Subunit: 274 residues, 2 copies
Amino acid sequence: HHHHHSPQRIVALEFGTEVVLEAGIEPVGVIEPVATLYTAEEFEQLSTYPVVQSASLEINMEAIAEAQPDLIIGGVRVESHDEYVGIREDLEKIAPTVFFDFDGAGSGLRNMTLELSRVVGDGERAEAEQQRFEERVEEISTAYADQLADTTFALVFGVDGEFAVVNTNAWGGEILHTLGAKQSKAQQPAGENFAAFYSYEEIDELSDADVIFYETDAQENPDPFTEALLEQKLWQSLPAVEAGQVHPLRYSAARTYAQANIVLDQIEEVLKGL
Amino acid sequence: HHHHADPQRIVALEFGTEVVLEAGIEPVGVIEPVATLYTAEEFEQLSTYPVVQSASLEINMEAIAEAQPDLIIGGVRVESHDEYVGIREDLEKIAPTVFFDFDGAGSGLRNMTLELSRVVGDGERAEAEQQRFEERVEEISTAYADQLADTTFALVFGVDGEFAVVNTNAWGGEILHTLGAKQSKAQQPAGENFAAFYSYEEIDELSDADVIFYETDAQENPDPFTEALLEQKLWQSLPAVEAGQVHPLRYSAARTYAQANIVLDQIEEVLKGL
């Protein structure tokens, strides 16, 4: 009952989308597609599917009932567990309903979708990806052991009037940490929180950064807020920026091991010019 | 940072009005209601409440006293800091007093009131609005990425004998800028100022504008001066005016995130044209 080991018509609730897409399955119902999570091809594909959940996570039991699923899948944030006990009961009147809980913003997610991939019958590729991730981390950490030892990384995204520096326990900061990379001291105020927030005046916190990553969507596009952060004249004064070492980062969220490796690939490419 | 007693008898000074309204709180004391800032129903209601501050920002310390507050809230322009540290003292003798500073004419205001909404016990809805604003910018920017690339916007308001073109660091112009929109070159002489002023002779400075927004009050009514600008004979000469693309903009001076979303709605609607 651990993550590591030694159906025909699927409704995909939240986090179920990435699982069925990777398995080449077509869902009979899907949570409302958010464009930033998917490639252009994927999004225009996903839009051909009936919406059975809002992006606010509000579920449409009736629309699901019309979809006639034989299996309903999705992940749940562990904090909302008891809440989803009732939801599963309600949903199981339509079809067998498999939920999995996940915790934090790091490995918990890509493990959770590994379990969903097994359930929908795609455990082979999914377990392969997990092993590949673990191998690549080993291989990368020793192949560039020098660069990882003397370079300080930072991951940022922007919000409204402020920006964030991603912590060692979350998204691309988790993956960077798992690799063994050093990360900026802008992280320190985050504590157990996923990011540390700063005003545009506090951009100078990232002066110990030799390399900076900034989150983008699935098509390498920064959101306006992240672009706004890159525009600030105070930003154009950081060591890493006038070194030409500021790079885009796709799939920082890393909802699967397949996605998490794409992060490893981006981290690796930068290490080649380092 | 903005991103992450208990009251029942609140006096709302300047900028505290939008906060108590949005929270469904009836204030015991309120700054003199200016009708252009509120709906007909909001204004009608707000006139019931005792006036404890003048529209010229003069505080009636004894009217506040009789109101018997247990909490006094309001926002302060950053320039007038020390002058208000003083005021809080005399105020703190009446009840706990919360003043927040804000800077500029952009994101600083809706964040300041986000903080006041937290203080009065309404931080949930307030943070929801902030998150929703940030999501919808991201959303609108990508969904209309074409329109936003090919279109040049302008925001104008009228004054006596002159008119103004709003800059990228202020009000409706800031939000338009945050979205990623292109805006007219009439903004240039503003520099760091919130607006660039012109005579009715220089209306031709808006020839590159494909779309034009004109500030109105909370009830979609332009002020007489703005109304005069739209009457000028050189105005119906502009491309955007003879293309049918001149629209009213409410809540340009977006005081809260709820208001800043209503601005985004209006921009989205126009963008659903073009």
